[PDB]
Design an enzyme around this catalytic site. Structure first.
Site, PDB file in Angstrom:
ATOM      1  N   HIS A   1       0.812  -1.214   0.000  1.00  6.12           N
ATOM      2  CA  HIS A   1       0.000   0.000   0.000  1.00  6.12           C
ATOM      3  C   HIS A   1       0.848   1.268   0.000  1.00  6.12           C
ATOM      4  CE1 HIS A   1      -2.648   3.195   1.226  1.00  6.12           C
ATOM      5  NE2 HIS A   1      -1.778   3.438   2.187  1.00  6.12           N
TER       6      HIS A   1
ATOM      7  N   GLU B   1     -24.036  17.765   4.913  1.00  7.88           N
ATOM      8  CA  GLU B   1     -23.222  18.979   4.966  1.00  7.88           C
ATOM      9  C   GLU B   1     -21.839  18.783   4.353  1.00  7.88           C
ATOM     10  OE1 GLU B   1     -24.646  17.562   7.659  1.00  7.88           O
ATOM     11  OE2 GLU B   1     -26.498  18.774   7.506  1.00  7.88           O
TER      12      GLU B   1
HETATM   13  C1  LIG Z   1     -25.568  18.046  10.688  1.00  6.14           C
HETATM   14  O1  LIG Z   1     -26.429  17.882  11.758  1.00  6.14           O
HETATM   15  C2  LIG Z   1     -27.650  18.576  11.639  1.00  6.14           C
HETATM   16  N1  LIG Z   1     -27.858  19.286  10.544  1.00  6.14           N
HETATM   17  C3  LIG Z   1     -29.019  19.931  10.461  1.00  6.14           C
HETATM   18  C4  LIG Z   1     -29.954  19.862  11.487  1.00  6.14           C
HETATM   19  C5  LIG Z   1     -31.322  20.558  11.443  1.00  6.14           C
HETATM   20  N2  LIG Z   1     -32.359  19.548  11.181  1.00  6.14           N
HETATM   21  C6  LIG Z   1     -33.087  18.960  12.173  1.00  6.14           C
HETATM   22  S1  LIG Z   1     -34.163  17.760  11.581  1.00  6.14           S
HETATM   23  C7  LIG Z   1     -33.618  18.105   9.978  1.00  6.14           C
HETATM   24  C8  LIG Z   1     -34.113  17.385   8.747  1.00  6.14           C
HETATM   25  C9  LIG Z   1     -35.241  16.404   8.915  1.00  6.14           C
HETATM   26  O2  LIG Z   1     -34.943  15.403   9.868  1.00  6.14           O
HETATM   27  P1  LIG Z   1     -36.032  14.330  10.113  1.00  6.14           P
HETATM   28  O3  LIG Z   1     -35.512  13.401  11.161  1.00  6.14           O
HETATM   29  O4  LIG Z   1     -36.524  13.865   8.772  1.00  6.14           O
HETATM   30  O5  LIG Z   1     -37.172  15.004  10.911  1.00  6.14           O
HETATM   31  P2  LIG Z   1     -38.756  15.193  10.795  1.00  6.14           P
HETATM   32  O6  LIG Z   1     -38.877  16.532  10.109  1.00  6.14           O
HETATM   33  O7  LIG Z   1     -39.129  15.203  12.238  1.00  6.14           O
HETATM   34  O8  LIG Z   1     -39.334  14.078   9.977  1.00  6.14           O
HETATM   35  C10 LIG Z   1     -32.616  19.112   9.956  1.00  6.14           C
HETATM   36  C11 LIG Z   1     -31.975  19.550   8.691  1.00  6.14           C
HETATM   37  C12 LIG Z   1     -29.568  19.040  12.634  1.00  6.14           C
HETATM   38  N3  LIG Z   1     -30.327  18.890  13.699  1.00  6.14           N
HETATM   39  N4  LIG Z   1     -28.420  18.397  12.647  1.00  6.14           N
HETATM   40  C1  LIG Z   2     -10.311  10.676   6.561  1.00  2.40           C
HETATM   41  O1  LIG Z   2      -9.481  10.759   5.453  1.00  2.40           O
HETATM   42  C2  LIG Z   2      -8.399   9.848   5.445  1.00  2.40           C
HETATM   43  N1  LIG Z   2      -8.247   9.025   6.470  1.00  2.40           N
HETATM   44  C3  LIG Z   2      -7.212   8.190   6.443  1.00  2.40           C
HETATM   45  C4  LIG Z   2      -6.327   8.196   5.384  1.00  2.40           C
HETATM   46  C5  LIG Z   2      -5.143   7.224   5.285  1.00  2.40           C
HETATM   47  N2  LIG Z   2      -5.423   6.177   4.290  1.00  2.40           N
HETATM   48  C6  LIG Z   2      -5.030   6.252   2.978  1.00  2.40           C
HETATM   49  S1  LIG Z   2      -5.580   4.931   2.045  1.00  2.40           S
HETATM   50  C7  LIG Z   2      -6.326   4.264   3.466  1.00  2.40           C
HETATM   51  C8  LIG Z   2      -7.105   2.977   3.500  1.00  2.40           C
HETATM   52  C9  LIG Z   2      -7.172   2.156   2.239  1.00  2.40           C
HETATM   53  O2  LIG Z   2      -7.573   2.938   1.132  1.00  2.40           O
HETATM   54  P1  LIG Z   2      -7.690   2.171  -0.211  1.00  2.40           P
HETATM   55  O3  LIG Z   2      -8.197   3.130  -1.241  1.00  2.40           O
HETATM   56  O4  LIG Z   2      -8.370   0.846   0.046  1.00  2.40           O
HETATM   57  O5  LIG Z   2      -6.239   1.983  -0.695  1.00  2.40           O
HETATM   58  P2  LIG Z   2      -5.310   0.804  -1.229  1.00  2.40           P
HETATM   59  O6  LIG Z   2      -4.520   0.422  -0.010  1.00  2.40           O
HETATM   60  O7  LIG Z   2      -4.503   1.521  -2.247  1.00  2.40           O
HETATM   61  O8  LIG Z   2      -6.143  -0.321  -1.744  1.00  2.40           O
HETATM   62  C10 LIG Z   2      -6.133   5.092   4.607  1.00  2.40           C
HETATM   63  C11 LIG Z   2      -6.701   4.769   5.937  1.00  2.40           C
HETATM   64  C12 LIG Z   2      -6.624   9.159   4.324  1.00  2.40           C
HETATM   65  N3  LIG Z   2      -5.852   9.309   3.275  1.00  2.40           N
HETATM   66  N4  LIG Z   2      -7.673   9.947   4.391  1.00  2.40           N
HETATM   67  O1  LIG Z   3      -1.855   6.298   3.286  1.00  2.00           O
HETATM   68  C1  LIG Z   3      -1.217   6.796   4.210  1.00  2.00           C
HETATM   69  C2  LIG Z   3      -1.540   8.167   4.731  1.00  2.00           C
HETATM   70  O2  LIG Z   3      -2.748   8.644   4.144  1.00  2.00           O
HETATM   71  C3  LIG Z   3      -0.020   6.071   4.757  1.00  2.00           C
HETATM   72  O3  LIG Z   3       0.270   5.009   3.864  1.00  2.00           O
HETATM   73  C4  LIG Z   3       1.180   7.017   4.872  1.00  2.00           C
HETATM   74  O4  LIG Z   3       1.407   7.597   3.606  1.00  2.00           O
HETATM   75  C5  LIG Z   3       2.470   6.352   5.341  1.00  2.00           C
HETATM   76  O5  LIG Z   3       2.289   5.802   6.644  1.00  2.00           O
HETATM   77  P1  LIG Z   3       3.392   6.137   7.767  1.00  2.00           P
HETATM   78  O6  LIG Z   3       4.722   5.621   7.227  1.00  2.00           O
HETATM   79  O7  LIG Z   3       3.384   7.635   7.963  1.00  2.00           O
HETATM   80  O8  LIG Z   3       2.916   5.397   9.004  1.00  2.00           O
END
Ligand SMILES: COc1ncc(C[n+]2csc(CCOP(=O)(O)OP(=O)(O)O)c2C)c(N)n1
Ligand SMILES: COc1ncc(C[n+]2csc(CCOP(=O)(O)OP(=O)(O)O)c2C)c(N)n1
Ligand SMILES: O=C(CO)[C@@H](O)[C@H](O)COP(=O)(O)O
Ligand SMILES: O=C(CO)[C@@H](O)[C@H](O)COP(=O)(O)O
Ligand SMILES: [Ca+2]
Ligand SMILES: [Ca+2]
Ligand code: NA
Ligand code: NA
Lengths: 664, 667
Positions: B260, B410
């Protein structure tokens, strides 16, 4: 009374409490009341007289805006939540805040509101129950046996965190997790088809869940049969697709976005009473309805039966029972402090230049045998974050283990760990590269808000990681953690500070601790006994002069060695210089004023902060008349040594900035 | 050469460049090389000699750790990326950084690395193409017609953001989006079955995608058939599940986590050359292989044909063609500055005490007719964030519209909008409650890193939102934005500052702009012509005294009204005071030293910051000898007016704190 009348008590209390507050969300409580009546009256195992009963079922309202649903349930079933609190919904210092809060209200299991995090917390509670049962249950003695029930809506389903946690719940075969989806077709923007068209049932089958489609969420018989089916499936979490009408009962607002998030209005409430046939005034509940809802008698019988079961377990398994009680209380082993201090002293006496990611692994190895409550993991970075110790056993391989392979699921991991800490019995640690705290950022905040103990192991803390470049190199992330209320943040400069920070994190009782750890090797600093003891005070004098300093360097983490080198050069010229190591600003700020003055004397304004992170933070300690050797930009892809030179983390630049500051 | 030999050129360059850097990721480039060879040589519509061609296909590497894959492709096909740059992989100021970066490298469309965001960006590019085509194409004149291709791996699939953006792509029926999943069974912790067991095909079926299962990702003919099938499906995005072997070619590391993220090693590279039959030395490519990979002649021909199509369009539709060129270049209408200034001046002359969320809506209504390039939306909060204006038209209702119902997504929204801004043709705005910037936080950072123009409309900015309580009430979020490199953050105090901030944001071509907006009504302040012009300088003197002030209040947003009231009380008692309004710290900091000294003179140390946000930020401007009337805790659920009282945002408290500060200075 009929089941519909019992459910209508929730509807009435909810619409009336929202109306009195002139604020809140009547729609979801009204839509879910029939489901809640069946779940709570026929299935939920709980004791209103002891909301902390270790073996209770856990209920989570992920669609937390529907807070009057849970307040109605807690009031009706006999928790310590009187009618006067429901009449104070959304009012200052009431037990009925607008979104439910753990700690504020008897029976509330987690703080929700931010969509998607409740279902994540529920996944963590279910992981905790499964793991605790595997660790503690013995033949003839199943002291851990409870369900985790969650309500969630369209918002939780749309959020990415639902994908993370429900995918993992499928892998982990969490058969005691049962979720109810409030499938009402409405969100704030209107009819959801314009933006949400998933075949949600098919999606959840793709995760390995058991899914029950097309439940009439306003028909007790349909709901009850579905819950029975879900409970009978023991090898898969279950999703109940409950078709509901938001605002059920309201002639003019049922099925409309208008019912989501504002009071119905007095005239509409009167029409709703008519449609529901609800004859009682606001905040009036007749004695027949309380008698059918109250859970005190049954709950106390069930908890007493469990207590008798636990007593029998303790006679057969005394040491295990003592551990269960200790861990459910969140208490530390009585000898932990002494043993951890012994480890710290051994590190100071036996110096090593290692990365603080490795020093962190070494602390996990030292603590692991002492803290069987650990339930740790990494978001697919075990060999890079260094989260495994010799005693780690992954729960996908051994259900009685202590380690979770979270996959590439940083937000879900962190909110799952919040559920683990809320459950009791465990001390979770989580881990990713520090940059990716940004993926999990609101779950980190929620741990702090909920006063939860979780150690957050964030490696690869700066440009010191080198070639992976600016998408990976933190700059401003630590500053944001440092200004989060109730968050503790430690950036240790060597293996000794790393062990102290780990000890601080596991000993917190009332909030989380982020460890800010290096990829690259860090030199160990020499310390006197007093300095060694003062690491835990967050900031301390590492290098000093005789008399009042003329110049104070304040440094953290990997930059302490640079600050010491600048100190040596200026000391040899005859400057009265000092180096302060500041591994934790929050722990330092909590020290007494005499201690803080002893470290950072108020009369000494010539202060130079040195940290490979955003400069703007450090005005808090250097003011307007100091200097900061920090970052002001994103990083670059290059070897770490060349980045430190490129960005000014050199002895020459630190010395020059100090001299420029002393020349005024 | 055979197709496998041509793919092996990517494998050789990738393993050798990683080896020379002693750093990087050989596994994914080696695993995906055959897929890349088919896609790039047989399908991709592009011109290496003009990476900015408006109608090119867009390619995105969401598994961005495999950066040598894209550098190999760009080099081999004839982009301006010489072999010397590949020899400088992961070296300071090379064109080959360890994760690909837009702007650093000819032909790189987006900056990836952080998993999941590339597929999000690709969804945004596909939305942009669909919308632009609907707006501009005319009968006989289809000037917009291009595909969006993305590569992604297990990490992107596990991330929540993939659920957000792929769900929405399904709703929007993005038939020109084609994603290739590198289904190799491996992640950093090892064999993925311990943590990742989804039926990914079934999941994507649930989103409404067209899924092609079980493709042999090492068989060019199979890959080609699958791409042809996906192109033929016009009403759904497509997912090609490509079964690959990570590190393909390496006898000892193929199929292992070891491939990787570290160099293979020189001994293993020698064995890999032998297995692959690749005889050429590191960084050696023979002329015959370049001849088969090069895309200059085909790319020229395709762009020349498009240019003739555009010329015919411009003859038939001259005003539309001029708008297309303007918008693809990111230029603003020539009269926008004057019209926006006229609007701002009208607001200053015609006070209105309204919430800044409403002032924001009013600016959208004013700008909307002038900026047909807007492509705006909210994460299921249109009626609360106030993102609709009279001319909004949702693209799920009419593809030629200008508004996106993002749903409760979001992070995905923000990273989609990054793709929209990267595509060209649009000016995206996004919106949610400020608290929920935390859900989208790294996508905001990525907009800043990529120097992208996007306006982020963040409402409900403080305890002023009231009863929803501490899970919703921002405290420390603005400070986090303020310390982000290349971010612009505005917290306007009234409807006038709100319009100035909106103008600043839409005119900011080299980074994003966050608007920090209130639920509750904000008083309008009086301003001279000079003060009105000074809002855009980020911090400015709003109230003053004759001579050196004893005391300077620094306030933002909803707290300017409170600071002015305190100033008025103290002034009536004979205190020499000043009020500075600081709507944008970043803009203020960018002003020259003389201007900053004129606003915050170094001689005046008695400074009082007033803001319903985390106090610790404000040491930057008040130093160690001032005072801060700020928040130090989470909020509470109560009516806003009671929260402001509870937390000390009252005239009596601000005056008392200022007098206490002065007493300390005097003694
Ligand atoms: C990212 O986190 C987050 N973003 C936006 C809101 C505001 N909010 C409450 S509810 C709802 C959309 C509708 O949520 P839903 O469960 O379908 O509810 P009902 O209207 O009761 O059916 C939204 C958009 C929140 N509280 N938390
Ligand atoms: C939240 O954002 C985020 N978190 C962790 C990493 C590090 N990282 C790169 S790759 C991979 C896991 C495996 O990713 P995957 O595409 O299956 O790759 P291959 O090993 O090439 O198959 C992980 C865990 C990242 N770059 N970005
Ligand atoms: O994919 C990742 C980071 O996104 C890793 O593969 C690093 O690029 C290398 O790992 P370390 O040697 O820093 O532990
Ligand atoms: O669900 C939500 C917030 O999460 C909304 O329903 C608000 O609770 C009320 O909206 P505004 O009246 O503040 O626009
Ligand atoms: Ca709903
Ligand atoms: Ca993989
Ligand atoms: Na079950
Ligand atoms: Na297609």
């Amino acid at each position: 009374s009929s089941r519909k009348e019992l459910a209508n008590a929730i509807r009435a209390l909810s619409m009336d409490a929202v109306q009195k507050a002139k604020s809140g969300h009547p729609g979801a409580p009204m839509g879910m009341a029939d489901i809640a009546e069946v779940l709570w009256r026929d299935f939920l195992k709980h004791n209103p007289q002891n909301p902390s009963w270790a073996d209770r079922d856990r209920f989570v309202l992920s669609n937390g805006h529907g807070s009057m649903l849970i307040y109605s349930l807690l009031h009706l079933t006999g928790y310590d939540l009187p009618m006067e609190e429901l009449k104070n919904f959304r009012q200052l210092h009431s037990k009925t805040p607008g979104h439910p809060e753990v700690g504020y209200t008897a029976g509330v299991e987690t703080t929700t509101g931010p969509l998607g995090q409740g279902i994540a917390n529920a996944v963590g509670m279910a992981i905790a129950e499964k793991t605790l049962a595997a660790q503690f249950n013995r033949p003839g003695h199943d002291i851990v046996d409870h369900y985790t029930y969650a309500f969630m809506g369209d918002g939780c389903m749309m959020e990415g965190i639902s994908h993370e946690v429900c995918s993992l719940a499928g892998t982990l075969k969490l058969g005691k997790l049962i979720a109810f989806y409030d499938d009402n077709g409405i969100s704030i923007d209107g009819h959801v088809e314009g933006w949400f068209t998933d075949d949600t049932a098919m999606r959840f089958e793709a995760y390995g869940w058991h899914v029950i489609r097309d439940i009439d969420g306003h028909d007790a018989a349909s709901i009850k049969r579905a819950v029975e089916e879900a409970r009978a499936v023991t090898d898969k979490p279950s999703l109940l697709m409950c078709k509901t009408i938001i605002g059920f009962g309201s002639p003019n607002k049922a099925g409309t976005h208008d019912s989501h998030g504002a009071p119905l209005g007095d005239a509409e409430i009167a029409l709703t009473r008519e449609q529901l046939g609800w004859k009682y005034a606001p905040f009036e509940i007749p004695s027949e309805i309380y008698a059918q809802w109250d859970a005190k008698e049954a709950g106390q019988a069930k908890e007493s039966a469990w207590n008798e079961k636990f007593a029998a377990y303790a006679k057969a398994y005394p040491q295990e029972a003592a551990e269960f009680t200790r861990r459910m209380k969140g208490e530390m082993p009585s000898d932990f402090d002494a043993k951890a201090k012994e480890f710290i002293a051994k590190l100071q006496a036996n110096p090593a230049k290692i990365a603080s990611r490795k020093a962190s692994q070494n602390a996990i190895e030292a603590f692991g045998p002492l803290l069987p409550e650990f339930l740790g993991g990494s978001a697919d970075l075990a060999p890079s974050n260094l989260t495994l110790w010799s005693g780690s056993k992954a729960i996908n391989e051994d259900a009685a283990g202590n380690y979770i392979h979270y996959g590439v699921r940083e937000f879900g991991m962190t909110a799952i760990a919040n559920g683990i800490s809320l459950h009791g019995g465990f001390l979770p640690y989580t881990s990713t590269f520090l940059m990716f705290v940004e993926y999990a950022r609101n779950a980190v905040r929620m741990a702090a808000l909920m006063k939860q103990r979780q150690v957050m192991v964030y490696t690869h803390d700066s440009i010191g990681l080198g070639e992976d470049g600016p998408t990976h190199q933190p700059v401003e992330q630590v500053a944001s953690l440092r200004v989060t209320p109730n968050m503790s943040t430690w950036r240790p400069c060597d293996q000794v500070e790393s062990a102290v920070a780990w000890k601080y994190g596991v000993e917190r009782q009332d909030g989380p601790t982020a460890l800010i750890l290096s990829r690259q090797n860090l030199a160990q600093q020499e310390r006197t006994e007093e300095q060694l003891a003062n690491i835990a005070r967050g900031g301390y004098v590492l290098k000093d002069c005789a008399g009042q300093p003329e110049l104070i360097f304040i440094a953290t983490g990997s930059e302490v060695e640079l600050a010491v080198a600048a100190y040596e050069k200026l000391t040899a010229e005859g400057v009265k210089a000092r180096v302060v190591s500041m591994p934790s600003t929050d722990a330092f700020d909590k020290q007494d004023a005499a201690y803080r003055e002893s470290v950072l004397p108020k009369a000494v304004t010539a202060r130079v902060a040195v940290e490979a992170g955003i400069a703007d933070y450090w005005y808090k300690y250097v003011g307007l008349n100091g200097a900061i050797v920090g970052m002001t930009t994103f990083g670059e892809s290059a070897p770490a040594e060349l980045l430190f030179e490129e960005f000014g983390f050199t002895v020459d630049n630190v010395v020059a900035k100090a001299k420029e500051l002393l020349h005024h």
